[PDB]
Amino acid sequence: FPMYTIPEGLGPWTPIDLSHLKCPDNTYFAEEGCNEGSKVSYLELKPSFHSQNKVQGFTCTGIISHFIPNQRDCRQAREWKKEGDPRYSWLILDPAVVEMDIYNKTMFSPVLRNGYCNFSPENPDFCETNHQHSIWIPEDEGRGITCDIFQASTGILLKNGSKVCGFQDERGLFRSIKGACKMIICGKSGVRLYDGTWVSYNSVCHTVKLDNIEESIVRDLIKKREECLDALEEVMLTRSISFRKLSLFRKQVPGRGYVYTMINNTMMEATGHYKSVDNWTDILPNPICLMVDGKCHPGYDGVLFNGIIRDSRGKILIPEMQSHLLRDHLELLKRNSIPWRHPLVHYSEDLTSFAQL
Amino acid sequence: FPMYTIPEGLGPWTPIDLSHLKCPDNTYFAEEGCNEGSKVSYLELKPSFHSQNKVQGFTCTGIINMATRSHFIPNQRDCRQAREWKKEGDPRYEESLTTTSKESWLILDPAVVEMDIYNKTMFSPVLRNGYCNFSPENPDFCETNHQHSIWIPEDEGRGITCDIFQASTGILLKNVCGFQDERGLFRSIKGACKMIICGKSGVRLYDGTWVSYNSRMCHTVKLDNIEESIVRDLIKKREECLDALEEVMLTRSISFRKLSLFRKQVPGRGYVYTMINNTMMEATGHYKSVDNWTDILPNPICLMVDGKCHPGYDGVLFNGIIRDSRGKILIPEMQSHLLRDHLELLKRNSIPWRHPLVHYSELTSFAQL
Amino acid sequence: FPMYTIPEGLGPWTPIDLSHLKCPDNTYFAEEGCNEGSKVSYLELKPSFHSQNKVQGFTCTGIINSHFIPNQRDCRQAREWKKEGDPRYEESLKESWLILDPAVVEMDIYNKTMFSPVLRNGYCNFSPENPDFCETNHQHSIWIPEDEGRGITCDIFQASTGILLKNGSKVCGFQDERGLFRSIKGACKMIICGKSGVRLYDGTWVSYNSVDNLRMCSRSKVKLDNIEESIVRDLIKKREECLDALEEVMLTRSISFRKLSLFRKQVPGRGYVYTMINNTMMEATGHYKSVDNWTDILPNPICLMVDGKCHPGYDGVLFNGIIRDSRGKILIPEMQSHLLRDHLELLKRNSIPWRHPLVHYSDLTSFAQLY
Ligand SMILES: *[C@@H]1O[C@H](CO)[C@@H](O[C@@H]2O[C@H](CO)[C@@H](O)[C@H](O)[C@H]2NC(C)=O)[C@H](O)[C@H]1NC(C)=O
Ligand SMILES: *[C@@H]1O[C@H](CO)[C@@H](O)[C@H](O)[C@H]1NC(C)=O
Ligand SMILES: *[C@@H]1O[C@H](CO)[C@@H](O)[C@H](O)[C@H]1NC(C)=O
Ligand SMILES: *[C@@H]1O[C@H](CO)[C@@H](O)[C@H](O)[C@H]1NC(C)=O
């Protein structure tokens, strides 16, 4: 476990719900007798693609007693309110972020009926929401779907004579072949590696295979994960989080993983390629500049990503780093409120509780 | 400490308050010089007995209306009448409706209390001074911290019974150091003493289990005969469960993850907690070591306890175990070791009920009902 | 780290806010080749000095309509009628002053600036334009100290006698009158109330000028590089555990006597001592010493030995998590935990209710629910 990790080539931020935060996958396999290879021109996935499984949406509830709304007017209602004249009819409650896999494009969320939904002839452009009379709609009719998900990059396919022991990234990251498998995405053939990255290079598929690891390291990963899950348990309870606690969601080993922040009291997600950091100067060459992708990362409203913030005098507070310095800071400790809980998440079975709005 | 641990002989559930959660005693002692012996036949304690510490009950509060509101000290007789009306759907609701005056007995339940199984002394924060004793001046009821609110057990008999033994067969091992369960789990004489229960002759072992045979200071643990590293881990584990308990009592919610911290990590007698009807539930069981998940999970959807797949309640089992939507058995410790996160195991499950007369300081605000 | 730790020469209690809880400094430096030296007779700091950071105060709000800006002593007169009884409560039911207290503020004891969220933009300085009060983030509410002199004083010194230790003619450390070695590592020279002396790394000052102290002190208000790795990351475990304790207090406005004991200094030396009275948190200051055997401090189940005398406590609460049960047994959280003896009274989350309305405030007004 390096002292620290910092994302390389960070993707754009997507707003998410609290329930979307996931504890990092901290597995990383070493390089042994596998160092030489041939440079392989291959395309891999752009960082936005890994934020394609979060589809923005709103919900719609009709009334005079509640009635079953239909998509067309729900949209023009949702298009108003985005600027406001009538304010009522169809009650529009947002954000309603859902997950969806790239393959069947199935949607998954507690606000959707039976936990999930699939666009069908009977619902071509909406989901039912296990409410009496509320239907869920995405914010882009096309659900931010696209296949412009690849870019050119140069790596080295690693020799072991004839056989392939692994891969090495354009960044330099050794990614092994231990948990690699072959899979087409968007009509291109490529390899799917344990780490999460997909690469286009062809030779010869949530879970985790953990049989070839020393007890000591599999115990440490379980330690790490449980720590993070307690924090998640408490974030979900209190709808709040401290920048300290948020740092437990930072992928602790080099590799692809999520990067988390808070903007406008909403949790935000992006994808990056994590690189080991050995010296605080390597990412803070002076106290006021967090170096990410060769640029000072400015942040927003004093908040960078992954629990990093900026104090009252402009200095960067990296939780892990302050903690190793025994220098406590109330700003790292204060609970940041994430108020929004969507009404129809915990809903069951003349006018609902969301008569409030 | 075994990988996991599963109850044998799982007794019936009784409802408890969150405060009755009790972090397990994880002490278990070795067999290093006690080979074989003669199979003896004996009486041990039915699990239900170990739940005689808890006595279900309710509370009753006199209610005088207005005219054009007030408090009186009712008697058990028609508190019990109004309580029974509340159990079936008699218009006891009409009672709590609003010169002209109305008398009503406001029933508030559950009010589970703790009881000295011998003193028969009940303990609660609802009882006046946190305890109560039946007397000729209160034959069948108790006083609370509210002068106009009485406490009454649901069973006039407070489940006091002596039908608490029954027949079991095991092995007395020769050296004589201890006895082997009908479950085959060694118990040592280490930390044992003598005592009489329902007039009977028997020994109590460190486990607390009682067996009928003979070949006397008697709750406590001494833990001297324990190496440093182990007692550190016992403390480590216990403090970890106490953290869970503190947050449970505060938040009045509990996640199945954390619920698993109350299971006895070692074989022997201990409690088994589950959640039925939005209420904590307690039963007693004899715990058995587990070395391979497939011994309890003959397939993904069957949890093996007392020979049968446990059906579980509301797709939820005990000790933090649940069923997913398809029936898959989620055992927290198991999932955790596979690095497989489940929100079902993380959602804080609400145990909302909090009795008004707990920590009440001498018409009342608790009264709009 | 000693099994436990007990405050010697315990000063008085100052009511603090929850946010004023601080996680201890568990550093301590051993002796190597620093055995004996010359006895000395010095001045050291009264423990109350270390709570001079906390200036009590109240806020006075002018009601007539709160639409009236109150004069400073239209407010003290109102506040002193709250302290006792009087018509105060009858103005609240033409000109009247709603008093809202406590309103503790931190103060830098040299430039005398006060800081708190009830103050305008979170801080305050006296000026000829407010020689005896402060502004709030509400235009009709001022803030006023409880003492005109904000606890300022130079009567902060006490006479005690130490041992000045020698390796060579180089001085390596002191031995306070309690007996506890305090090294010279990270010591500096400073002037308090016009006396000059050395500030040792433990938060203590003694008047006694020694050689090789050519550098003066920067901020009274830690750093640490020459310590065993194992030790430094042990300390980080303790700090982090205390910081978690604190994150939940601030959120929930409550704390258990289990949790509270995580704030006690794990090593001998100057440290804060915390308790609750009257549903308010409370800080004091003492010179902690190692406890090696519980009976040293618990000679008998009902008496906790602090400064020769049994500590009475207040409402069954003595400090640092120590409480008295229904019998009057002394429950030291650490001691109960090592015996695996659970007690609900330790787990119980004790409420710290008070939230002064004017914290981050931004006709008539809403918190004016007549009090
Ligand atoms: C007194 O000294 C303190 C330094 O401890 C100064 O504190 C700063 O005050 C500004 C506003 O006045 C705050 O925004 C800063 O956060 C404070 N810094 C610290 C370190 O507390 C204070 O300004 C000084 N006052 C005077 C009059 O010199
Ligand atoms: C946050 O809110 C402000 C105010 O409405 C808005 O202008 C801003 O664009 C929002 N944040 C981002 C990242 O756009
Ligand atoms: C029963 O025992 C408890 C302590 O174990 C005591 O508080 C209670 O008063 C006793 N009552 C009687 C009647 O012995
Ligand atoms: C606590 O409150 C009482 C008044 O009820 C008062 O007499 C006592 O001095 C207070 N003690 C402290 C330490 O504040």
Residue numbers in the entry:
A (entry chain C): 2 to 65, 85 to 108, 131 to 246, 252, 261 to 404, 410 to 417
B (entry chain B): 2 to 69, 84 to 113, 126 to 202, 206 to 245, 250 to 252, 261 to 404, 411 to 417
C (entry chain A): 2 to 66, 85 to 112, 129 to 256, 263 to 403, 410 to 418
Question: How do the authors describe this structure?
Answer:
Glycoprotein (G), as the sole protein on the virion surface, is a key factor mediating lyssavirus invasion. After receptor engagement, lyssavirus enters the cell via an endocytic pathway, during which the G protein undergoes a series of pH-dependent conformational transitions to catalyze the fusion of the viral envelope with the endosomal membranes, thereby initiating the infection. The lyssavirus G, which belongs to the rhabdovirus G family, has been defined as a class III viral membrane-fusion protein. Similar to its vesiculovirus homolog, RABV-G also consists of three domains: FD, PHD, and CD.
We successfully crystallized the IKOV-G-ecto protein at pH 8.3 and determined the structure at 2.9-Å resolution. In the crystallographic asymmetric unit, a total of six IKOV-G molecules, which are of essentially the same structure, are observed to assemble into two IKOV-G trimers. Overall, the solved structure clearly shows a bended hairpin conformation. Rather than forming a single elongated helix F and extending out from FD in the intermediate conformation, the residues L380-H384 of IKOV-G adopt a loop conformation, resulting helix F into two short helices (F1 and F2) connected via an inter-helix loop. The inter-loop and helix F2, however, turn back to facilitate the following CTR loop being trapped in a surface groove on FD. The segment composed of W395-T412 in CTR interacts with FD, both through hydrogen bonds (H-bonds) and hydrophobic force. Within the trimeric architecture, three protomers are converged together via the CD domain, with three C-helices almost juxtaposed to each other to form an inverse frustum-cone with top and bottom radii of about 10.5 Å and 6 Å, respectively. Instead, most inter-protomeric interactions arise from the contacts between helix C in one protomer and helix D and the F1-interloop-F2 element in the neighboring protomer. In comparison to the previously reported structures of pre-fusion RABV-G determined by Cryo-EM, IKOV-G exhibits a similar trimeric architecture. Taken together, these results indicate that we have solved the structure of IKOV-G in the pre-fusion state.
